[PDB]
Amino acid sequence: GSAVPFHGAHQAGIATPVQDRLHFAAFDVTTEDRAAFVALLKEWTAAARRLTAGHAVGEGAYGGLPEAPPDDTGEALGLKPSRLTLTIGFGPSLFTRFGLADLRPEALADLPKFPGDNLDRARSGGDLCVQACADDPQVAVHAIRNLARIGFGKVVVRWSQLGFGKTSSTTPDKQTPRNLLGFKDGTRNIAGTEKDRLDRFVWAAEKDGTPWMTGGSYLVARRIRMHIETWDRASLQEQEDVFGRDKGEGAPVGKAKERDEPFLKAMKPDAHVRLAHPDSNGGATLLRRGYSFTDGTDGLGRLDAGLFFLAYQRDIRTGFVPVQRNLATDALNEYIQHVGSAVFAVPPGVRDADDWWGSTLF
Amino acid sequence: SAVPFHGAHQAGIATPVQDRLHFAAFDVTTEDRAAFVALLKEWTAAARRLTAGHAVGEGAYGGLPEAPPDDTGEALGLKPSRLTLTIGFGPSLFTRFGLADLRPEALADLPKFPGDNLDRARSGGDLCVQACADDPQVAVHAIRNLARIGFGKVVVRWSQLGFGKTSSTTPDKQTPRNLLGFKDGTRNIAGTEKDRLDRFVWAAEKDGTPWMTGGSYLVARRIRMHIETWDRASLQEQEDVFGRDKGEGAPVGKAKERDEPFLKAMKPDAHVRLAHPDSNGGATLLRRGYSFTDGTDGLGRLDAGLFFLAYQRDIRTGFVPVQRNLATDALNEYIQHVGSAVFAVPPGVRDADDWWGSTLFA
Numbered sequence: 001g002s003a004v005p006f007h008g009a010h011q012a013g014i015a016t017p018v019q020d021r022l023h024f025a026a027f028d029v030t031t032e033d034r035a036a037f038v039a040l041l042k043e044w045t046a047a048a049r050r051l052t053a054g055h056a057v058g059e060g061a062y063g064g065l066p067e068a069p070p071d072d073t074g075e076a077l078g079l080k081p082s083r084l085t086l087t088i089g090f091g092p093s094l095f096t097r098f099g100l101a102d103l104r105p106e107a108l109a110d111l112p113k114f115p116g117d118n119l120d121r122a123r124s125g126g127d128l129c130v131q132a133c134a135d136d137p138q139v140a141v142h143a144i145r146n147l148a149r150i151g152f153g154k155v156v157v158r159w160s161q162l163g164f165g166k167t168s169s170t171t172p173d174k175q176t177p178r179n180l181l182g183f184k185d186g187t188r189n190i191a192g193t194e195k196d197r198l199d200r201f202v203w204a205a206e207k208d209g210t211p212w213m214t215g216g217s218y219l220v221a222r223r224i225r226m227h228i229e230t231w232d233r234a235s236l237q238e239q240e241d242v243f244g245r246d247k248g249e250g251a252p253v254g255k256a257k258e259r260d261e262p263f264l265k266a267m268k269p270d271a272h273v274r275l276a277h278p279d280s281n282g283g284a285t286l287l288r289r290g291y292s293f294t295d296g297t298d299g300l301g302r303l304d305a306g307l308f309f310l311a312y313q314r315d316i317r318t319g320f321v322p323v324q325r326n327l328a329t330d331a332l333n334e335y336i337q338h339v340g341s342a343v344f345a346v347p348p349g350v351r352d353a354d355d356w357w358g359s360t361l362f
Numbered sequence: 363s364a365v366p367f368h369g370a371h372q373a374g375i376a377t378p379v380q381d382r383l384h385f386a387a388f389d390v391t392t393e394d395r396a397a398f399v400a401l402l403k404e405w406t407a408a409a410r411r412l413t414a415g416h417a418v419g420e421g422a423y424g425g426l427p428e429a430p431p432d433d434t435g436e437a438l439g440l441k442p443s444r445l446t447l448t449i450g451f452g453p454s455l456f457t458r459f460g461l462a463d464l465r466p467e468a469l470a471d472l473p474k475f476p477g478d479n480l481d482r483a484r485s486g487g488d489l490c491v492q493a494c495a496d497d498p499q500v501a502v503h504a505i506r507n508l509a510r511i512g513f514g515k516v517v518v519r520w521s522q523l524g525f526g527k528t529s530s531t532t533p534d535k536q537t538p539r540n541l542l543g544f545k546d547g548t549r550n551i552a553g554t555e556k557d558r559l560d561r562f563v564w565a566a567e568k569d570g571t572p573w574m575t576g577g578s579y580l581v582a583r584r585i586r587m588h589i590e591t592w593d594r595a596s597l598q599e600q601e602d603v604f605g606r607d608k609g610e611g612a613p614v615g616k617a618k619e620r621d622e623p624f625l626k627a628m629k630p631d632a633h634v635r636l637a638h639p640d641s642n643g644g645a646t647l648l649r650r651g652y653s654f655t656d657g658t659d660g661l662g663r664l665d666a667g668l669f670f671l672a673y674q675r676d677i678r679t680g681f682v683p684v685q686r687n688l689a690t691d692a693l694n695e696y697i698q699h700v701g702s703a704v705f706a707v708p709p710g711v712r713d714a715d716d717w718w719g720s721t722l723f724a
């Protein structure tokens with residue numbers, strides 16, 4: 001139920017322990033007035049400080065003027081902060097507005113087309129994002145709803161994704177969660193305690209070429225549908241061969257324990273772990289922070305199931321792109337399809353109570 | 363920790379309300395009564411395992427490598443999480459298997475109600491399984507595995523995820539709020555009120571359908587809220603709609619949430635005034651619904667609402683009168699009923715030898 005500190009050199013919600021629930025929203029900007037957009041970023045920051053502390057936005061949820069709408073929509077009254085983090089990102093499309101073209105980071109690379117892609121343009125892209133993670137889904141929804149309300153007339157929601165359950169880990173001391181294929185997902189990630197690895201692979205540095213982004217990160221979001229019907233008729237051995245780990249313990253093939261180090265040459269050459277491992281990718285390492293979803297049925301008699309894949313990295317060109325390219329032959333591709341995509345520059349942290357989201361850019 | 367599966371009644375009705383919901387409606391594809399009975403037996407066996415936090419069949423790993431695992435594995439390492447599985451039979455089931463004369467008269471088709479906008483794809487169903495648990499992955503795993511066991515005999519027609527409180531952070535006796543920000547559940551039938559359950563919830567032998575004695579009748583309504591319109595309404599307008607204040611949830615003119623309402627003091631079309639038993643010839647319901655938030659729609663609006671579930675001894679003396687009385691409800695401006703289904707929920711599984719539906723199939 002505790003609060004995660006909002007202020008810092010970095011935004012919370014990245015290295016932070018992974019919370020149980022996600023509500024991710026991509027927004028498009030509808031104002032061409034830079035000053036109004038700045039005002040919104042300031043108002044949003046003020047609301048975020050309230051929300052992440054378990055407090056109502058503005059003057060509260062009730063007890064104001066009877067004739068006015070309440071400042072806060074009220075559905076989180078009486079609830080704990082629930083480890084809420086709110087993380088903002090700017091998409092490549094934002095830099096076409098407000099005189100920002102020259103400030104677009106080179107590290108904010110457009111993704112190439114990948115084999116097998118079937119991207120829904122309506123559930124892709126976005127001028128900006130807000131990642132709301134918390135242990136209570138009502139707290140997360142309340143946060144996105146109230147930010148959207150404050151932003152009426154200046155931003156609209158383009159698309160959103162709820163995650164019902166995490167599929168990622170930044171805390172190796174705690175149980176690794178399973179994805180809907182039934183395998184632990186998150187064993188070999190980057191932990192929040194690994195400052196050296198975070199500096200090497202996740203946070204942008206000044207020398208990288210874009211000063212305003214120092215202490216920020218770059219996010220890739222990929223909506224991935226899972227072919228559950230096909231997977232569920234696969235043998236146990238086929239399933240384990242796809243990954244290169246056993247299903248029960250999640251140990252590397254031939255080994256006894258989950259966290260024993262992989263011996264890659266014992267895996268099939270198309271195994272997911274073998275292809276995705278840093279040693280197969282010139283050392284490229286990601287912070288994975290995704291969640292599972294189910295969006296009803298497919299209309300054809302089956303449950304829908306997928307994974308909303310989130311990866312943070314110091315540079316898209318040296319993180320997601322090389323790794324995903326190396327997955328072109330992945331055995332897992334028979335059971336998945338990427339159906340949505342977006343990239344964002346995640347700015348540095350809000351340093352103190354006088355700072356605001358995006359201040360280093362604007 | 364766990365809720366017992368066996369009893370005179372199915373669990374999931376009068377047993378404590380768990381934090382999360384996965385509700386699935388199924389259609390039957392087989393015409394063979396013996397094949398269907400065999401499925402009900404297999405489903406009951408699986409339910410006994412699932413409600414005790416065990417994998418179905420011979421497990422999720424450790425079997426023949428060349429066979430698919432019996433359990434899909436995504437709940438390994440999770441706790442029972444107070445999982446209950448509640449099965450119900452829709453009107454349409456009784457058109458199969460020679461059952462047409464055993465449909466209960468209390469399993470009435472609902473009338474069309476003013477303002478209904480029902481999506482046929484998200485309505486109806488030959489069968490339902492209500493999976494409730496504190497961990498949504500435990501609920502989803504149950505539905506996914508029941509659907510897998512049944513494939514070839516049933517398909518999933520529609521599926522709904524929902525949430526109430528998060529018990530880890532929110533005290534037991536605190537009334538949850540719905541997404542309009544009002545306390546929801548103050549005046550309900552409690553699972554503790556054994557006599558009131560016998561009067562208003564459980565079917566009795568003398569009601570006319572012997573196989574249903576100890577069962578109940580379920581109405582499900584997927585009710586969208588027009589969130590963005592509501593959030594523009596003044597505080598007074600919102601309180602007037604219900605007849606209770608927003609902060610405390612007290613009836614107008616009273617001081618505390620649990621003060622009995624004075625109906626005369628509320629506006630004539632206030633929701634509480636219209637829905638109260640005194641306004642409906644004594645008709646009283648067990649409400650056991652869940653909030654939902656599915657994402658955002660095409661126009662950028664929140665697809666969110668209440669997945670309304672009510673249990674009652676007879677649909678004709680429970681939901682139908684009360685919902686009819688809501689024809690002039692002030693709340694109608696802000697909601698829309700968009701899916702509907704009714705089910706007869708059989709009596710409990712008495713012991714290890716019993717099975718879901720045994721009183722019907724014989």
Ligand code: HEM
Binds near residue numbers: 224262309
């Ligand atoms: C639905 C899609 C996916 C599934 C089910 C999945 C599943 C898994 C599993 C079971 C593991 C082993 C446990 C672990 O170390 O986390 C793993 C590792 C990994 N995955 Fe994926 N994965 C998916 C998509 C991706 C994608 C899109 C990427 C990157 C482009 C990726 C990058 C990795 C990395 C880097 C590792 C760690 C390898 C190592 O260093 O040992 N995964 N995945």
Ligand code: HEM
Binds near residue numbers: 542623688697
């Ligand atoms: C989105 C839809 C709905 C919302 C937001 C909602 C909200 C509320 C609220 C805030 C209360 C007052 C607190 C309480 O006693 O629970 C209430 C009471 C009640 N609602 Fe609704 N309601 C909805 C739909 C319905 C429907 C469809 C029915 C029945 C057909 C219904 C039946 C009742 C009943 C019986 C009460 C208790 C009245 C009493 O005895 O005092 N509600 N509802």
